[PDB]
User: Fold Omalizumab Fab from Homo sapiens.
Amino acid sequence: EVQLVESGGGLVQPGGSLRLSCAVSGYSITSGYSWNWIRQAPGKGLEWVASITYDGSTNYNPSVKGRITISRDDSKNTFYLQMNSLRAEDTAVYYCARGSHYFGHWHFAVWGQGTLVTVSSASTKGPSVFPLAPSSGTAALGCLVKDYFPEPVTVSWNSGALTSGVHTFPAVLQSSGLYSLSSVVTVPSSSLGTQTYICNVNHKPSNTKVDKKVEPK
Amino acid sequence: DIQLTQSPSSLSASVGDRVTITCRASQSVDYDGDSYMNWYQQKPGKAPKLLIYAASYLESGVPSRFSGSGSGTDFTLTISSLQPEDFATYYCQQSHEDPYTFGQGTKVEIKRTVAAPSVFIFPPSDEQLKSGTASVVCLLNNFYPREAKVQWKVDNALQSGNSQESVTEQDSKDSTYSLSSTLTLSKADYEKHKVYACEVTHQGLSSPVTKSFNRGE
Assistant:
């Protein structure tokens, strides 16, 4: 099965440069008709910015032309995106995507997971994880991920074993300039003694990974 | 460039109903008998998923309730019968010429029966109080519609300007929403009071439901 895995996202200074990579597995990069980069910013939908065909022909969106370079490395089965002179408007989730050999080519059936590039002059900051202890039927518990920058933070429960009833709320921007979110889950009250609940928090921009157990106070 | 405009911008349809989304291109996307209009489905946190290519061809693996039609500048995406898992933002995309452009997106929500929220209140953890800040969280779980009002009361005193709300996306499992309200206070301000209440008013609730606790009890 073809998989596209992205890396290189995170915080970049205004006027700095980004370097993203899209590692392709289960599929040879030389076999795709084209490999593309597509970014998604809030209020701007989706925007195609760059492409490279199987013969090495490159093409770019005029809205970014002059500060963008898409390249390829067949030996590593990876293609890259390079942008410089970054502006705050370049803040977006960047996707890599494969074109088609059929029906006009430039539609995309295979996508990466997307990585968020934040163009800001502020500093990175790791979050603090606090428990939302249950009261003691259906019980509610969760974790509080407070004061981090920039986005994103991923939260799972019991290394992915617990997914039912999970609600990870979108982050909110506090007046201090730092983000904060919480993740909850509904569990039976009779399970509060016996079942262990651990929220897995990950903030890659600060290299902060925390496993916090939530138990009654 | 070719600009795509979708209509409507959003819609809320009863489950099982027929859904029609239109896309108008500023120029024709026809070429040699084919129409190069494509449709994507994007669910929260996921990359866009290809549904339709060349205006009317169904991508492999996509349920047959999705279909596309149209030619030239006008195109239609049809869901024959809306299912709970079809909650997403839908995009059209032309592949007739570069730069390959997308529509602004159409958010599709499932209209279900009115459901009351399960209200839970969480006192600040002792681990957080050591840092000098208190966060009181009030959870509204699995309700519909998305419209819910929450207001805090600290010793019968209505709070204002010290809370933030975050709403989840519609859950495909039951077409419900979840809301969290986070009351942020300083540790000193938190220790000077006793009763912390969360008052919730919703359409599915005849009388407003209030959950509270006593600090240190």
Summary: The two ends of chain B are 65 Å apart (CA to CA). Helices of chain B lie at 126-129, 187-191.
